[model samples]
Target chain A: GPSVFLFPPKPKDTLMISRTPEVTCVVVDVSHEDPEVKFNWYVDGVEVHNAKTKPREEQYNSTYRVVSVLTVLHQDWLNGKEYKCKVSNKALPAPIEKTISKAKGQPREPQVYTLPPSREEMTKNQVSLTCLVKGFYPSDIAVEWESNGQPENNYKTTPPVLDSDGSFFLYSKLTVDKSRWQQGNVFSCSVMHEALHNHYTQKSLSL
Target chain B: GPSVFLFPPKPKDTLMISRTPEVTCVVVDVSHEDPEVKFNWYVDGVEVHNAKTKPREEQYNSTYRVVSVLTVLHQDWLNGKEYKCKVSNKALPAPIEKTISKAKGQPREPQVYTLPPSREEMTKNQVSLTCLVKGFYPSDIAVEWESNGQPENNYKTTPPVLDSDGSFFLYSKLTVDKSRWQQGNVFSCSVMHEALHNHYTQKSLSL
Candidate 1:
């Protein structure tokens, strides 16, 4: 009862857009499960309603952990709307405040998954690969496909997918025919985002 | 439509007990926007209806990556229950099934957080300390407080608190005497769980 701490102690302001291009922002730790504690969501300066709120409690427990979530259009976030969560309870010395700020840095590394549908398709044969670049902000990204350590073309990639958590996940694919993929060949997926301007990040799966 | 990835590939099966003693489980993924794609939530071999499910879609440059989620309770997850999410699509040769298996083995390491109101009271002052241990599993845990390499008794630790994610958290507190408060003393918090049965895990904050 003496202290109240918020998760994401420092709010990650930059939200990656969802396919709906919406951002679902979460702020935790209002008052416990106490009925008297009131929670509020604010965007810019105006109050929002019907935000999804969940409070999980324990039997005979005085407090339950609560999390409040709000989803807003990606367009509004770029417009620089201030998003905040406020928690009020008698136990709290004062209402606690947590803000959502755009993430201020480059996205973390990409996750690469490879496919070998059959023994014959494994590595030295037909090679297929998928690169999932997630939890990134500011959208603009470039992914290049490479084969045998050299840049190659004719790869198909899905447009960036927006996630509820305000991050973006980009998926790209690469496939090589048995001819060039035979023997020993290397396949790589490289990504370039604003966070890595002038720099390139690549993940390779050797065949 | 090259692949369908289910997060946690194997639903992390565990009973999530909230303060209210409720359980919440989640399962996600399939493909988005394909008319032939269908998703289902099952508990104990039966389909769950009216469960909360949200599908997000984006159409830009073609292709949709859709994810579907299902949440359930502790009671439904137990009694030898089997919870699973099955995704069926024409593109997939077979339906992808992710089951929530009872988490086997000990919980993960508990994260420790210490709080001392004022620095002046640390190591040698008011000498009060609180340790928050979270993100562990299987519930049973032990916590002890030490000062300057010596086991000092007199601390209170709360029962483990369970989270919606099927994990656990705990809180412990210690207070020492002004007379015992001496310069350059080190304060340490040690935690024990099934995951660390043979070993002792401790965190130290020095003055």
Candidate 2:
């Protein structure tokens, strides 16, 4: 046993969020024995290293911090929506560990799965929809759907599944009124799987 | 209300598993739709396409069966393991959805992280090492340290981190008995990330 110890103390962290739509940033700290510790970034649980998406970058693997920025893409703000962040450590010769922020990011971006290049159909009535956006880390995923111009609901979800290729996947489904979907009504699949943490980016594709 | 029915109930025919590892292989038979619907694969809750880690020869984004394989490399036998499968009716007019069966394949081979280069230490000593071997999926990753000829009970670890360039890293600290290390003793770090669906395969890089 070493003379001093500071580890495995039920790792936990808190994230502060404002009611108004804005970007949120947070820092993650790691300890290292060697001075040459390196660093990286991730939003939710997904690894991030894109110069474009990052507000700024300063890596210190052994002992470093990652900043996550959140932005709202779209939201109706009906019931109580919930969101959160996940931070991970990635160094060799070490066990994989993570910390989930206590706070949550309200409405996240919605995932849109489009029909396979089909003739645009006028969607009507109650549209049963399921919106899910997945990625490497769990916190990095969010699910939301819009038929016409209203926010959809989520029916069910499962724990994440990690693949052998070091990849990950998750899902959430729901049923909604079809009246929300109109011909060329514009179905969007906004996403937050990218590097940014707090805010979600939008990509309007034909659904 | 349009009548939507799930055929065979458990459309996930074969559930891949160790020895007889349960793997979910779905076979759909559409009568009026020209049998041309799209199938999606998911493990635990994450959705993985056969294309991500697939070889260059594999066609991606195609409507064919996207082989979504998950695994647990080290084969740590644990209860509470679940997987899911789904199929969507891409037929024009209205696309019906189905939740297929859930099966697991043989567990994947655990990759070992070597200390980069081999080393020789005295009987009573301290040694630093790095063991690595990439090429596993689905299973949660973990590692253990060893001494003269016994397993080290305690070790320090870092969080699971991946570089934006798609590289992942994890680390741990261990204290070795100098006497044991001097005898050209070997230290190994085993990984378990793949869903142990098929036969368990373990991989290691000698230091």
Candidate 3:
């Protein structure tokens, strides 16, 4: 059967991703009122057909929403300038277009600094771990704290602040008990930036 | 004048802000095609006409677009429920509606903390004004430091530290010369939460 207008009915316009750093799959969704529409995927302008396009149905009262998802690799998303999705139906005059852009800048490795606090002239005992990631183009970076090889989330992270040079500086602090320091437990600061190949920068604690 | 169906043309959809913690003006723009239209503004479902609704004309070939601006006080935005803007034109069957949301939570007050560095272990002389604001819902709180009443921008703030109680905590730190400490100059930390009128919570120190 026929459907909602493409050019006639309407037109439409339009992530940190993850820690795995492996082959990350990026997906873009295109939704229209008509369900039986065609999907075209592109990477930097070249038509890509090897990707998967899924058809989904959504009902909002009398309106039926049709959507197609376009998926690609992390590298394709990082390198491709115009990752786009086009929607077409037999009832429409022309195709509707939408594109996805990877955030600008290659991921840069982070530098870690171990700040200090003393057991004297203060409350209990603790030490602070500060991590500085500088000059990274794409600012979406993740930092982690591991105590004895186990992931720990009880820490603090600053929102990325941009430098004058169009890069980003992220500061994160993890404070641990002086008792843990006395135990000689290995504490590591790991940074996961997008460009890192499934591995992150890790610095050990000494002070 | 008759035009492309407002319903046929495919309707489209689409915030508040300021630096100070004082009376903030929040404006939302509702733009839709088919010019000769009716606009309705509502605060928590109560019809409101006090808001300024100015209409102008826009045309692109056979399409007509009209925009309505809804402006309200920050308190109105926080206390008001179900903020809405509705548009109706002869080309459409029913009125199209849009809504605005105040992030979950009743705004609460903020707390500040000041941290000091080594007097014996380290060289150089600078103290850190670290402010921690916690247990506040609706995380849109502002924190700033002033040296002798002058707003200082050279500081860092952490992304809201989220707690299990569905509230937010923010941390901000400013570093100043210990010489200022010797000079006995007044350093202040001020916080602005939506709950506070024009007033701010301030913590002051000398030396």
Candidate 4:
């Protein structure tokens, strides 16, 4: 029996906008020795008329690689249209199919909180401010630290950590001399993520 | 300062596999009046030499739209390399930059469990088996129901629900006549997700 491999569309390929007149494409690659294999493409269960199949090429192990491409307007892709690719071979008992579409869940905004340094660290003449960011989706995020209205470069930011539920949490730390805290300087932590209304959120703390 | 919009890459763009020798492209769209705006593309902090900038075009509100594209080998993309697009305009205080990379967190497999129909459900001459799936990432998943080795089409599957800790949970129910349960017929719930080793997992129950 022939083996079929349907390549799924990447999330970015469906979610991001480019210039107008753009078209999104989905490609499927299959490996088989049978020359009679057929390819079909569907959108929302209806056959897609514009699907294209490339000539099969021989591979190293005498197997053939078959390819097919399906194209749709970018607007339809953004509208959460579903695409499916099906492969059928005479040697197989059943046809193989794969489906792709936009993710179902909505983007969730993260909650931001700032915590002052613990007393043990304060005794060492320094303090570490912790910025806790939690409950966000789509994982791509940036955390920035600011002191007295200027960006602080020495801060350490942890990679986003996945929580038990399907959300994420991240921690960013800014260490400063206790002298700066005693002098009443404001420290701020700002986050940039797609889920936020303005693509940004901030939390500030001072002694 | 002119506002710049650098579209971030989608998580799937860098995560999935296709035919080899593929090229991954990033597109940035900007809105401004200045024709002298410039774009620089970087990978892991180093400037990308093959970046291309498109000509500015007039928009509906008399503003101008500029576009730029950055292309890289698919291998570099899958290697978790970071891509950044920096936009500079004469009217801006500083250049605006956006970065994209493969997600840092690894794919987490879901935990699957099967629950028998409650006593109340069985008292009504119908019983429903519940398949609980939780703690999975990347959201795309499929659930299938089976009875006595045959596919069951009348099952109900819930949309993946995001958990508070950054994972996901879903429930799939299979309703069968109480007589089927009393006959010792086997019912099964199978899941298909990218995070699974074989892209499939299953749970079965029989009274």
Ranking by lDDT: 4, 1, 3, 2
Q: Give the C-alpha miss distance for residue B192 in model 2, angstroms.
A: 2.0
Name the candidate, 1 or 4, with the larger lDDT value. 4
Report lDDT (Cα) of residue A74, candidate 4: 56
The iRMS of the candidates, in order, is: 23.0, 22.3, 20.5, 20.2
All candidates: TM-score: 0.28, 0.22, 0.38, 0.33
TM-score of 4: 0.33
The per-model DockQ list reads: 0.01, 0.01, 0.01, 0.01
Candidate 3, residue B52: Cα displacement in angstroms equals 71
lDDT by candidate, in order shown? 0.55, 0.36, 0.52, 0.67
Q: Give, for candidate 4 chain B, the lowest lDDT window spanning 10 residues.
A: B18-27
Q: Candidate 3 residues A90-193, lDDT tens each?
A: 55577666664655555565455554445461266666656666666566566666653234544788888988876777777777776776554656666656
lDDT minimum window of 10 residues, candidate 2 chain B? B9-18
Candidate 4 residue pairs that clash: A163-B165, A164-B165, A165-B165, A165-B166, A165-B167, A166-B163, A166-B166, A166-B167, A167-B166
Q: How far out, in Å, is residue B25 in model 3?
A: 63
- Chain A TM-scores for all candidates read 0.44, 0.34, 0.66, 0.52
For model 1 chain A, the run of ten residues with the poorest summed lDDT: A9-18
